[PDB]
mmCIF file of C-alpha atoms in Angstrom:
data_model
loop_
_atom_site.group_PDB
_atom_site.id
_atom_site.type_symbol
_atom_site.label_atom_id
_atom_site.label_comp_id
_atom_site.label_asym_id
_atom_site.label_seq_id
_atom_site.Cartn_x
_atom_site.Cartn_y
_atom_site.Cartn_z
ATOM 1 C CA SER A 1 -3.815 29.421 6.002
ATOM 2 C CA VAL A 2 -3.479 26.164 4.044
ATOM 3 C CA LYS A 3 -5.516 23.205 5.280
ATOM 4 C CA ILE A 4 -5.150 19.699 3.808
ATOM 5 C CA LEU A 5 -6.989 16.396 4.168
ATOM 6 C CA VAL A 6 -5.184 13.123 3.579
ATOM 7 C CA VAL A 7 -7.355 10.094 2.924
ATOM 8 C CA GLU A 8 -5.486 6.770 2.929
ATOM 9 C CA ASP A 9 -6.249 3.400 4.464
ATOM 10 C CA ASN A 10 -2.730 2.842 5.878
ATOM 11 C CA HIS A 11 -1.437 4.916 8.756
ATOM 12 C CA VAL A 12 2.136 4.429 7.552
ATOM 13 C CA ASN A 13 1.344 6.226 4.295
ATOM 14 C CA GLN A 14 -0.468 8.936 6.243
ATOM 15 C CA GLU A 15 2.620 9.538 8.360
ATOM 16 C CA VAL A 16 4.897 9.683 5.347
ATOM 17 C CA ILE A 17 2.861 12.140 3.254
ATOM 18 C CA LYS A 18 2.124 14.294 6.321
ATOM 19 C CA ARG A 19 5.892 14.434 6.976
ATOM 20 C CA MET A 20 6.621 15.343 3.336
ATOM 21 C CA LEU A 21 3.959 18.059 3.547
ATOM 22 C CA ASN A 22 5.295 19.364 6.859
ATOM 23 C CA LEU A 23 8.683 19.612 5.139
ATOM 24 C CA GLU A 24 7.091 21.569 2.306
ATOM 25 C CA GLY A 25 5.798 23.975 4.921
ATOM 26 C CA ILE A 26 2.233 22.731 5.435
ATOM 27 C CA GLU A 27 1.265 22.105 9.065
ATOM 28 C CA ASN A 28 -2.518 21.891 9.058
ATOM 29 C CA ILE A 29 -2.985 18.308 7.866
ATOM 30 C CA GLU A 30 -6.019 16.208 8.704
ATOM 31 C CA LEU A 31 -6.383 12.455 8.268
ATOM 32 C CA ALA A 32 -9.242 10.084 7.386
ATOM 33 C CA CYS A 33 -8.985 6.298 6.794
ATOM 34 C CA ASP A 34 -11.667 5.743 4.166
ATOM 35 C CA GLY A 35 -14.058 7.484 1.784
ATOM 36 C CA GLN A 36 -16.972 7.762 4.223
ATOM 37 C CA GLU A 37 -14.751 9.227 6.874
ATOM 38 C CA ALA A 38 -13.439 11.756 4.323
ATOM 39 C CA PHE A 39 -16.962 12.708 3.225
ATOM 40 C CA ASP A 40 -17.819 13.563 6.851
ATOM 41 C CA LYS A 41 -14.676 15.563 7.596
ATOM 42 C CA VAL A 42 -15.640 17.527 4.434
ATOM 43 C CA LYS A 43 -19.383 17.811 5.075
ATOM 44 C CA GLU A 44 -18.337 19.257 8.434
ATOM 45 C CA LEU A 45 -16.016 21.970 7.127
ATOM 46 C CA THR A 46 -18.753 22.802 4.633
ATOM 47 C CA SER A 47 -20.728 23.863 7.722
ATOM 48 C CA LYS A 48 -17.909 25.879 9.310
ATOM 49 C CA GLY A 49 -15.678 27.838 6.965
ATOM 50 C CA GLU A 50 -12.110 26.607 7.082
ATOM 51 C CA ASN A 51 -12.493 23.960 4.361
ATOM 52 C CA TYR A 52 -9.629 21.975 2.789
ATOM 53 C CA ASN A 53 -7.454 23.703 0.202
ATOM 54 C CA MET A 54 -6.713 20.227 -1.225
ATOM 55 C CA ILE A 55 -7.565 16.587 -0.735
ATOM 56 C CA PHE A 56 -5.153 13.641 -1.320
ATOM 57 C CA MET A 57 -7.140 10.444 -1.617
ATOM 58 C CA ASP A 58 -6.376 6.761 -2.120
ATOM 59 C CA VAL A 59 -8.245 5.464 -5.139
ATOM 60 C CA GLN A 60 -8.857 2.087 -3.392
ATOM 61 C CA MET A 61 -10.093 1.981 0.204
ATOM 62 C CA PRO A 62 -12.520 -0.242 2.133
ATOM 63 C CA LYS A 63 -16.058 0.903 3.044
ATOM 64 C CA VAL A 64 -15.982 3.891 0.649
ATOM 65 C CA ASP A 65 -13.280 4.028 -1.997
ATOM 66 C CA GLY A 66 -11.696 7.153 -3.504
ATOM 67 C CA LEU A 67 -13.836 7.452 -6.642
ATOM 68 C CA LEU A 68 -17.118 7.036 -4.738
ATOM 69 C CA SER A 69 -15.760 9.376 -2.074
ATOM 70 C CA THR A 70 -14.909 12.001 -4.692
ATOM 71 C CA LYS A 71 -18.336 11.593 -6.293
ATOM 72 C CA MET A 72 -20.141 12.180 -2.993
ATOM 73 C CA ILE A 73 -17.978 15.165 -2.072
ATOM 74 C CA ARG A 74 -18.525 16.654 -5.517
ATOM 75 C CA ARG A 75 -22.266 15.915 -5.879
ATOM 76 C CA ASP A 76 -23.792 15.835 -2.383
ATOM 77 C CA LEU A 77 -21.483 18.564 -1.076
ATOM 78 C CA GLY A 78 -20.394 21.295 -3.435
ATOM 79 C CA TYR A 79 -16.673 20.896 -2.950
ATOM 80 C CA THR A 80 -14.949 22.538 -5.896
ATOM 81 C CA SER A 81 -11.406 22.402 -4.566
ATOM 82 C CA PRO A 82 -8.613 20.049 -5.825
ATOM 83 C CA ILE A 83 -8.664 16.317 -5.155
ATOM 84 C CA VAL A 84 -5.548 14.281 -5.958
ATOM 85 C CA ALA A 85 -5.810 10.560 -6.576
ATOM 86 C CA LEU A 86 -3.169 8.266 -5.111
ATOM 87 C CA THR A 87 -2.589 4.870 -6.679
ATOM 88 C CA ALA A 88 0.168 2.588 -7.924
ATOM 89 C CA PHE A 89 -1.912 1.688 -11.015
ATOM 90 C CA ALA A 90 -0.726 4.592 -13.144
ATOM 91 C CA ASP A 91 -1.457 3.624 -16.749
ATOM 92 C CA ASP A 92 -3.019 6.410 -18.872
ATOM 93 C CA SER A 93 -6.186 4.384 -18.654
ATOM 94 C CA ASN A 94 -6.103 4.450 -14.854
ATOM 95 C CA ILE A 95 -5.352 8.164 -14.674
ATOM 96 C CA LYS A 96 -8.220 9.096 -17.011
ATOM 97 C CA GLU A 97 -10.665 7.130 -14.907
ATOM 98 C CA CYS A 98 -9.658 9.219 -11.869
ATOM 99 C CA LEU A 99 -10.204 12.467 -13.754
ATOM 100 C CA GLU A 100 -13.423 11.096 -15.252
ATOM 101 C CA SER A 101 -14.447 10.612 -11.637
ATOM 102 C CA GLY A 102 -13.875 14.250 -10.631
ATOM 103 C CA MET A 103 -10.285 14.060 -9.338
ATOM 104 C CA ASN A 104 -7.993 16.819 -10.620
ATOM 105 C CA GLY A 105 -4.623 15.246 -10.270
ATOM 106 C CA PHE A 106 -2.800 12.051 -9.546
ATOM 107 C CA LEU A 107 0.326 10.906 -7.766
ATOM 108 C CA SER A 108 1.663 7.373 -8.107
ATOM 109 C CA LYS A 109 2.561 5.332 -5.061
ATOM 110 C CA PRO A 110 4.947 5.081 -3.513
ATOM 111 C CA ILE A 111 4.548 8.823 -3.754
ATOM 112 C CA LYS A 112 7.769 10.700 -4.505
ATOM 113 C CA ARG A 113 8.583 14.010 -2.782
ATOM 114 C CA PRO A 114 9.355 15.934 -6.016
ATOM 115 C CA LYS A 115 6.110 14.723 -7.578
ATOM 116 C CA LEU A 116 4.292 15.920 -4.450
ATOM 117 C CA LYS A 117 6.035 19.280 -4.853
ATOM 118 C CA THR A 118 5.075 19.396 -8.529
ATOM 119 C CA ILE A 119 1.421 18.707 -7.564
ATOM 120 C CA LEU A 120 1.460 21.380 -4.841
ATOM 121 C CA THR A 121 2.684 23.949 -7.302
ATOM 122 C CA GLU A 122 -0.069 23.307 -9.885
ATOM 123 C CA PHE A 123 -3.043 22.795 -7.545
ATOM 124 C CA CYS A 124 -2.282 24.562 -4.267
ATOM 125 C CA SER B 1 5.941 -6.863 -14.621
ATOM 126 C CA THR B 2 9.021 -8.590 -13.272
ATOM 127 C CA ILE B 3 9.481 -8.832 -9.505
ATOM 128 C CA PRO B 4 12.262 -6.364 -8.509
ATOM 129 C CA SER B 5 15.660 -7.887 -7.814
ATOM 130 C CA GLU B 6 16.582 -5.881 -4.719
ATOM 131 C CA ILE B 7 14.898 -6.491 -1.343
ATOM 132 C CA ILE B 8 15.146 -2.773 -0.454
ATOM 133 C CA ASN B 9 14.883 0.139 -2.886
ATOM 134 C CA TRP B 10 17.321 2.407 -1.027
ATOM 135 C CA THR B 11 16.323 5.362 -3.157
ATOM 136 C CA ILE B 12 12.972 5.270 -1.312
ATOM 137 C CA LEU B 13 14.203 4.129 2.104
ATOM 138 C CA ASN B 14 17.014 6.760 2.089
ATOM 139 C CA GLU B 15 14.376 9.390 1.367
ATOM 140 C CA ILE B 16 12.389 8.324 4.457
ATOM 141 C CA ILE B 17 15.550 8.202 6.486
ATOM 142 C CA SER B 18 16.410 11.718 5.317
ATOM 143 C CA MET B 19 13.200 12.954 6.928
ATOM 144 C CA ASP B 20 14.035 11.475 10.331
ATOM 145 C CA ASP B 21 17.100 13.521 11.130
ATOM 146 C CA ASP B 22 16.218 14.768 14.600
ATOM 147 C CA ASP B 23 15.622 11.341 16.141
ATOM 148 C CA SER B 24 15.929 8.045 14.208
ATOM 149 C CA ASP B 25 12.496 7.524 15.766
ATOM 150 C CA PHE B 26 10.651 8.400 12.574
ATOM 151 C CA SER B 27 12.050 5.890 10.088
ATOM 152 C CA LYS B 28 12.594 3.052 12.531
ATOM 153 C CA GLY B 29 9.116 3.685 13.905
ATOM 154 C CA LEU B 30 7.656 3.270 10.402
ATOM 155 C CA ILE B 31 9.516 -0.004 9.977
ATOM 156 C CA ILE B 32 8.372 -1.417 13.308
ATOM 157 C CA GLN B 33 4.832 -0.375 12.394
ATOM 158 C CA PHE B 34 5.222 -2.111 9.044
ATOM 159 C CA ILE B 35 6.596 -5.350 10.545
ATOM 160 C CA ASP B 36 3.491 -5.524 12.739
ATOM 161 C CA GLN B 37 1.125 -4.661 9.849
ATOM 162 C CA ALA B 38 2.691 -7.427 7.815
ATOM 163 C CA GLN B 39 2.211 -10.122 10.465
ATOM 164 C CA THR B 40 -1.339 -8.988 11.142
ATOM 165 C CA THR B 41 -2.171 -8.905 7.441
ATOM 166 C CA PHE B 42 -0.605 -12.299 6.652
ATOM 167 C CA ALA B 43 -2.776 -13.728 9.441
ATOM 168 C CA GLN B 44 -5.945 -12.012 8.198
ATOM 169 C CA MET B 45 -5.279 -13.197 4.626
ATOM 170 C CA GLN B 46 -4.727 -16.734 5.886
ATOM 171 C CA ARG B 47 -8.022 -16.607 7.768
ATOM 172 C CA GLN B 48 -9.957 -15.433 4.694
ATOM 173 C CA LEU B 49 -8.385 -18.201 2.624
ATOM 174 C CA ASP B 50 -9.387 -20.925 5.064
ATOM 175 C CA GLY B 51 -12.837 -19.465 5.620
ATOM 176 C CA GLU B 52 -14.912 -16.705 4.047
ATOM 177 C CA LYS B 53 -12.764 -16.740 0.891
ATOM 178 C CA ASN B 54 -13.853 -13.182 0.103
ATOM 179 C CA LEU B 55 -11.727 -12.069 -2.864
ATOM 180 C CA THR B 56 -12.575 -8.399 -2.390
ATOM 181 C CA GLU B 57 -11.333 -8.565 1.209
ATOM 182 C CA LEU B 58 -8.114 -10.298 0.037
ATOM 183 C CA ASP B 59 -7.766 -7.484 -2.523
ATOM 184 C CA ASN B 60 -8.211 -4.838 0.217
ATOM 185 C CA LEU B 61 -5.678 -6.685 2.394
ATOM 186 C CA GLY B 62 -3.140 -6.777 -0.468
ATOM 187 C CA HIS B 63 -3.819 -3.055 -1.051
ATOM 188 C CA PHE B 64 -3.256 -2.265 2.618
ATOM 189 C CA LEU B 65 0.103 -4.018 2.962
ATOM 190 C CA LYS B 66 1.293 -2.721 -0.467
ATOM 191 C CA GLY B 67 0.945 0.828 0.818
ATOM 192 C CA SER B 68 3.396 0.506 3.726
ATOM 193 C CA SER B 69 5.821 -1.922 2.063
ATOM 194 C CA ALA B 70 6.154 0.238 -1.074
ATOM 195 C CA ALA B 71 6.512 3.515 0.840
ATOM 196 C CA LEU B 72 9.379 1.943 2.770
ATOM 197 C CA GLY B 73 11.143 0.471 -0.254
ATOM 198 C CA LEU B 74 10.262 -3.181 0.471
ATOM 199 C CA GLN B 75 9.502 -3.426 -3.236
ATOM 200 C CA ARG B 76 9.479 -7.212 -3.554
ATOM 201 C CA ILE B 77 6.835 -7.478 -0.833
ATOM 202 C CA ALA B 78 4.864 -4.662 -2.524
ATOM 203 C CA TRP B 79 5.090 -6.444 -5.887
ATOM 204 C CA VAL B 80 3.634 -9.631 -4.414
ATOM 205 C CA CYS B 81 0.784 -7.659 -2.815
ATOM 206 C CA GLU B 82 -0.078 -6.126 -6.183
ATOM 207 C CA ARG B 83 -0.299 -9.668 -7.577
ATOM 208 C CA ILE B 84 -2.678 -10.512 -4.725
ATOM 209 C CA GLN B 85 -4.827 -7.474 -5.672
ATOM 210 C CA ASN B 86 -4.929 -8.492 -9.330
ATOM 211 C CA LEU B 87 -5.643 -12.099 -8.364
ATOM 212 C CA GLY B 88 -8.432 -10.854 -6.118
ATOM 213 C CA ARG B 89 -9.946 -8.928 -9.065
ATOM 214 C CA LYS B 90 -9.580 -12.027 -11.232
ATOM 215 C CA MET B 91 -7.331 -9.999 -13.521
ATOM 216 C CA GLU B 92 -4.490 -12.526 -13.406
ATOM 217 C CA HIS B 93 -4.439 -16.332 -13.568
ATOM 218 C CA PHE B 94 -0.848 -17.278 -12.780
ATOM 219 C CA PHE B 95 1.733 -16.572 -10.044
ATOM 220 C CA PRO B 96 5.423 -17.626 -10.316
ATOM 221 C CA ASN B 97 6.720 -20.693 -8.478
ATOM 222 C CA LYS B 98 8.872 -19.807 -5.510
ATOM 223 C CA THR B 99 12.117 -21.104 -6.991
ATOM 224 C CA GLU B 100 11.776 -18.945 -10.055
ATOM 225 C CA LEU B 101 11.088 -15.958 -7.765
ATOM 226 C CA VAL B 102 14.094 -16.503 -5.508
ATOM 227 C CA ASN B 103 16.254 -16.789 -8.658
ATOM 228 C CA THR B 104 15.584 -13.148 -9.394
ATOM 229 C CA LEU B 105 17.135 -11.979 -6.084
ATOM 230 C CA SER B 106 20.091 -9.654 -6.701
ATOM 231 C CA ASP B 107 22.063 -11.281 -3.821
ATOM 232 C CA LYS B 108 21.154 -14.978 -3.835
ATOM 233 C CA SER B 109 23.404 -15.601 -0.827
ATOM 234 C CA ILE B 110 20.719 -14.133 1.448
ATOM 235 C CA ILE B 111 18.825 -17.395 1.101
ATOM 236 C CA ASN B 112 21.280 -20.108 2.112
ATOM 237 C CA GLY B 113 21.170 -20.806 5.817
ATOM 238 C CA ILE B 114 17.386 -20.773 5.814
ATOM 239 C CA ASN B 115 14.597 -23.062 4.653
ATOM 240 C CA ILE B 116 12.555 -21.001 2.189
ATOM 241 C CA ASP B 117 9.466 -23.114 2.782
ATOM 242 C CA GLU B 118 9.672 -22.815 6.528
ATOM 243 C CA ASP B 119 6.700 -20.454 6.811
ATOM 244 C CA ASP B 120 4.564 -22.004 4.055
ATOM 245 C CA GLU B 121 0.964 -22.781 4.979
ATOM 246 C CA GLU B 122 -1.576 -24.919 3.165
ATOM 247 C CA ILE B 123 -4.988 -23.518 2.326
ATOM 248 C CA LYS B 124 -8.076 -25.334 3.675
ATOM 249 C CA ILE B 125 -9.921 -25.406 0.398
ATOM 250 C CA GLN B 126 -12.832 -27.443 -0.920
ATOM 251 C CA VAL B 127 -11.135 -29.313 -3.804
ATOM 252 C CA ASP B 128 -14.239 -31.207 -4.934
ATOM 253 C CA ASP B 129 -16.589 -28.216 -4.821
ATOM 254 C CA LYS B 130 -13.882 -26.364 -6.731
ATOM 255 C CA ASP B 131 -15.858 -23.633 -8.430
ATOM 256 C CA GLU B 132 -14.334 -21.195 -10.888
ATOM 257 C CA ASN B 133 -12.952 -19.167 -7.983
ATOM 258 C CA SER B 134 -10.690 -21.876 -6.654
ATOM 259 C CA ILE B 135 -7.837 -20.836 -8.928
ATOM 260 C CA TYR B 136 -7.752 -17.279 -7.559
ATOM 261 C CA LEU B 137 -7.859 -18.559 -3.996
ATOM 262 C CA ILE B 138 -5.076 -21.105 -4.559
ATOM 263 C CA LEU B 139 -3.035 -18.536 -6.451
ATOM 264 C CA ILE B 140 -3.421 -15.994 -3.602
ATOM 265 C CA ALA B 141 -2.350 -18.625 -1.059
ATOM 266 C CA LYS B 142 0.733 -19.336 -3.195
ATOM 267 C CA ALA B 143 1.471 -15.575 -3.190
ATOM 268 C CA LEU B 144 0.871 -15.374 0.567
ATOM 269 C CA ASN B 145 3.500 -18.052 1.033
ATOM 270 C CA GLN B 146 5.838 -16.077 -1.228
ATOM 271 C CA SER B 147 5.058 -12.923 0.834
ATOM 272 C CA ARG B 148 5.912 -14.608 4.126
ATOM 273 C CA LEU B 149 9.293 -15.463 2.600
ATOM 274 C CA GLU B 150 9.885 -11.979 1.181
ATOM 275 C CA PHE B 151 8.926 -10.478 4.566
ATOM 276 C CA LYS B 152 11.512 -12.781 6.168
ATOM 277 C CA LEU B 153 14.230 -11.598 3.752
ATOM 278 C CA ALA B 154 13.238 -7.947 4.310
ATOM 279 C CA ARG B 155 13.666 -8.406 8.074
ATOM 280 C CA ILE B 156 17.093 -10.005 7.525
ATOM 281 C CA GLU B 157 18.327 -7.012 5.511
ATOM 282 C CA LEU B 158 16.634 -4.399 7.722
ATOM 283 C CA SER B 159 18.127 -6.137 10.741
ATOM 284 C CA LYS B 160 21.678 -6.004 9.403
ATOM 285 C CA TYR B 161 21.209 -2.325 8.525
ATOM 286 C CA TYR B 162 19.901 -1.346 11.978
ATOM 287 C CA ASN B 163 22.185 -3.871 13.667
ATOM 288 C CA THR B 164 19.357 -5.363 15.742
ATOM 289 C CA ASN B 165 16.801 -8.122 15.092
ATOM 290 C CA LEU B 166 13.494 -6.675 13.901
#
């Protein structure tokens, strides 16, 4: 049973990735609009059992951004599962900063379906 | 980077449209949602510019609208928003005049029949007390005016595609 959390500040992007994921065969998708909100959805499932198999997270978001969010989830919680950074700033420099921050993979925006697929194969 | 020539990247929009096969409700719903996000965001940016002048907020606002515009192929609007983000982070210190930007349009004929300055708005900005942040603010206002125009053009094209004013 695959469970995924999508953290993005724009509902339109949430709807699109959720639709691309549904079309890949994944139905259990959860949404959050910022880093703090994602931390809580995760702290919660760290109390139940059914935790997220993967997390897709915007690098930049108000309140709590993606890097700070990742840091909290990694440190404060002990989440060891895959976190994929989403950003349009995709220079090697940018990508390394995401990994340096504890994020396993990256997808550039606007995210492309095949790239999503490629990410699902290597991390899911 | 150079602003893209085409108003709509059909490669991306066709992809979205290919996911809304049952009922055209999916893709057209995204568009309607975007249109509204754009008008709300332009207004919030304008407010910041005439008041708080918080560059981080303007950055967040550019980031927000770039997400929906880019995912729907409105690549010229998304480009401008990325300039607003970079301006907001004081990473850039220039933004192309409007004329030079319209000259990059793949189909220039989409402009005649309309005043391209029709939606322009001036920024209420302290010119005397111009600190080192004035440039970023003025540059973001210039880009907001460009955005209002690109939004306009995107609605023209989306309207002829859907055959119905959006």
